[PDB]
Design a protein around this nucleic acid. Sequence first.
DNA 1: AGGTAGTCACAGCTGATTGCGCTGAGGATTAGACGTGCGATATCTATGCCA
Length: 53
Amino acid sequence: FQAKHMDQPLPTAIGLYKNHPLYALKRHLLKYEAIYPETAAILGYCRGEAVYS
DNA sequence: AGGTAGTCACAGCTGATTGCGCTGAGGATTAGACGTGCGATATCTATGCCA
């Protein structure tokens, strides 16, 4: 199941990247949660929105 | 027999008493998230325009 569902659909809708840890959009975080640019530079894009692990 | 020290009966000084105030411990007491509603906005394709 993990192998099948590892980034298979490849969604590119802004709403889908929210509350989705597999994508973890920078703008779709919380006040207390924050990205780490050291281990996440770029993994994908959606309407000019970068993806971080 | 004589006078002032010991003894007892009362006076000033001061501490305890009785109203009342104050602290210290002790037990009582709407702001980012999470969504949607509305509104501005990208977005895909029919199809007939005349060269």
